[PDB]
Each structure stands twice: as C-alpha cells, then as structure tokens.
Design a protein around this ligand. Structure first.
Ligand code: NI
Length: 341
C-alpha cells in the first residue's frame, strides 16, 4: 500500500506514488523527476492529472507515451494554484528536470518535499528564504558522516585533464562513459568538448537527451558512432569483457580504451582524495570509478537543514530498516541541539 511519507496531509496529493494503483483520495499525482524508482507505474494508460516540470513532461510524452491531456507542466520559481492549493517548484540540483515542491496548506502549514536533491548554499536565496517551513520530506540517501565527496567541479576537472592527457599521448585511444538513467551529463559532455568530438550513442539514449532542453545539444551529441571518439554505453557494459567486445566492433580504428563509471559513493572516499584516484587496468583497457554525486553529502544535508530549521523531518530514503531509521533520527536531534531550534 502507499506509504505515509508519499502523502501530503490536508491535501488530496501524492508525490512519486505511481506504483500502488488508484490511491484512494488522490486528486493530483506529482512527479519530482524522471528516475525509474520514482515514475514506476506510469504509461499511456494513465488517466489522472500528473504535475511536474517541463523537462519531466517532455520525457513522459516521448519515452513513456503518456497522453498530453494528463501532463500538467509547471514553470519553476512561480506561485501556481493546483486543486485549490498554492504550490511552487524549485530546482533540486539533481538530474535534468528534477524539482523540490513547496506546498502552502489552507491551514497555514508550509511543507517542503525535496524529491531527490543535492543541497547547495544557492538554495538559501531562492523563494525558500521568504517564509518559514514547518515540515521537511527529506532525501536522506547519504545521511551518515562517512559520506564525503568532492564538488562536482573538482570531479569534472579530474575527468577532463585525464582524458585530454590520454588522447594527446595516444590519438588512437577511445573514451567510453557509462550511463543507465538521465543525470551526470556534464561527465561525457565536458570530456567531448575538450577533445573536439561529439558524443556517440544509441538511438534510444539520443532520443532521451533530446528531451532535456540543453542549449546547443545538436552541436554536442550524435548517433554516428564512426564520427565520434567519446562513446556512451550502458553502465552494465563498463567492465573488461564488455569493453574488449566494444573495441572489436570499432574495426581497428582504436587500440586502447579509457572508460569512466560515475558511481555515487564508493569507500575509496573514506581514505582517498580525488587527486589520488587510479584506474583498474587489464591490457589496453583502463576503467576509472569517479565519485560524481547528484545527492547531498552528509555535510551539505546538515547545512541545509540547520539553515531551514524545520519543526518536523520525514525521511524518504533508507526508511526500510529500524537501525537506519533510528540512526537518522539521532542525527536530526544532534543538528537541532547544535543550532538551537
Ligand atoms: Ni533520483
């Protein structure tokens, strides 16, 4: 059945709740972003109103074939009325089209649902600065102090410098980057920009990227693999067997692969700096795992919450075990006693 942390009290609304059939009492289904664990259940047969960003609405129409009459895209940073209730969509700093949702309840309660997000100090100057938020539905993916990672800018500098040095040493090296969802497009786009190439990819993945409103995208991507020296493959193929196989397909144009796997966190982060990352190598194939995150680190999450000072926190991630729930509640209390709210 639909869990309580997907329901907005005092409304008929749900958030990211498309896999439970008809939720009793729901008049509007919100979708924060186009990742499968959140859209699970949507299709061309859905006949209730879906509220989302413009970019998420492009993906619902083109990838899932949801009918246009049920897609309700909203502009960001704009007060809108939905079924009698004031709402605002804010940029979540996650994947393209991802939003947080502010609900202004008729009784005066204000609720923020973060969806999935990577907290940033820039959020402290959005429309959130303008009123008090009482309840926070929080993306707690990395809510434990072991989870440190570098800035996105530091990680992209590493990737660009590594790829440019390798290809300038060997002009017959191919660069491959893994993907299994939208998000993390800066990794492959930044590397292709430094090398003077388009990114080559499957027709399915090109279609997906063409829904994202990225400026000048026709200049950066292609389905012609032969004209490209940065290829995108499924994340599952980013291993020695998959890569050796791909190299065979390129017909002797290339004699070396340098591959990137943009993971979330990996426990090389508890010890190793970005400067010190090394690949796994077999023969003429090297694979780099780079810690490019689109979720908050522990410290980024803690700063956002201590700034916002909510009266009540409802976690939305890691909620399935009692030890995870109790650990998280302990951190929330620490933060509140340190900051004084
Ligand atoms: Ni997500």
């Amino acid at each position: 059945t639909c869990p309580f942390y997907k329901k907005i009290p005092g409304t008929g609304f749900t958030v990211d709740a498309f896999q439970y059939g008809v939720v009793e009492g729901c008049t509007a289904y919100f979708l924060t972003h186009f990742h499968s664990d959140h859209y699970a259940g949507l299709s061309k047969h859905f006949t209730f109103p879906v509220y989302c960003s413009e970019i998420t609405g492009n993906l619902l129409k083109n990838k899932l074939h949801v009918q246009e009459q049920y897609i309700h895209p909203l502009p960001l940073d704009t007060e809108c009325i939905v079924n009698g209730v004031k709402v605002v969509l804010l940029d979540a700093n996650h994947c393209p089209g991802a939003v947080m949702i502010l609900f202004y309840l008729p009784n005066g309660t204000v609720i923020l649902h973060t969806g999935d997000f990577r907290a940033d100090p820039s959020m402290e100057r959005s429309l959130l600065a303008d009123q008090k938020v009482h309840m926070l539905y929080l993306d707690t993916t990395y809510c434990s102090p072991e989870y440190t990672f570098p800035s996105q800018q530091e990680v992209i500098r590493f990737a660009i410098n590594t790829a440019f040095e390798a290809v300038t040493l060997n002009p017959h090296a191919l660069v491959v980057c893994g993907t299994y969802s939208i998000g993390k497009e800066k990794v492959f786009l930044a590397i292709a920009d430094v090398l003077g190439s388009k990114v080559g990819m499957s027709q399915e993945k090109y279609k997906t990227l063409q829904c994202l409103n990225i400026p000048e995208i026709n200049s950066l991507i292609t389905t012609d693999m032969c004209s490209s020296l940065v290829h995108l493959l499924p994340m599952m193929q980013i291993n020695f067997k998959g890569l050796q196989s791909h190299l065979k397909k390129c017909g002797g144009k290339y004699n070396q692969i340098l591959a990137f796997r943009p993971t979330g966190w990996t426990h090389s982060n508890k010890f190793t700096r970005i400067a010190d990352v090394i690949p796994q190598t077999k023969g003429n194939i090297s694979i780099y795992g780079i810690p490019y995150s689109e979720h908050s680190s522990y410290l980024e999450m803690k700063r956002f919450v201590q700034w916002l000072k909510p009266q009540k926190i409802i976690p939305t991630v890691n909620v399935g075990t009692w030890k995870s729930r109790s650990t998280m509640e302990k951190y929330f209390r620490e933060w509140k006693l340190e900051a004084g709210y």
